């Protein structure tokens, strides 16, 4: 249907919510790629928690 906002129901979160990444964020990593798949929101993560302006318990690599 031509529903809009529609996406109150657990979908793509289940995965980025399992995998340990909350709800805030696993939603942007899933609007940053275009809720086209929960690996896809897994590169955005990685990508992102990966810096000093976006401060997260996802610890990164040694350097990072």
Same mark, same amino acid.
């Given at each position: 249907? #031509?529903?809009?906002? #529609?996406? +109150?129901?657990p +979908?793509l979160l289940e995965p980025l919510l399992a995998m340990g990444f909350p709800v %805030? $964020?696993a939603?942007?990593?899933?609007?940053? $790629?275009?809720?086209? $798949?929960a690996?896809?929101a897994l590169?955005?993560? %990685?990508? %992102?928690?990966?810096?000093? #302006?976006?401060?997260?318990?996802?610890?990164?690599?040694?350097?990072?």
């Amino acid at each position: 249907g #031509s529903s809009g906002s #529609s996406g +109150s129901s657990p +979908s793509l979160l289940e995965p980025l919510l399992a995998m340990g990444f909350p709800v %805030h $964020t696993a939603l942007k990593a899933l609007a940053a $790629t275009g809720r086209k $798949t929960a690996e896809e929101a897994l590169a955005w993560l %990685h990508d %992102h928690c990966n810096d000093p #302006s976006l401060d997260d318990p996802i610890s990164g690599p040694s350097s990072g």
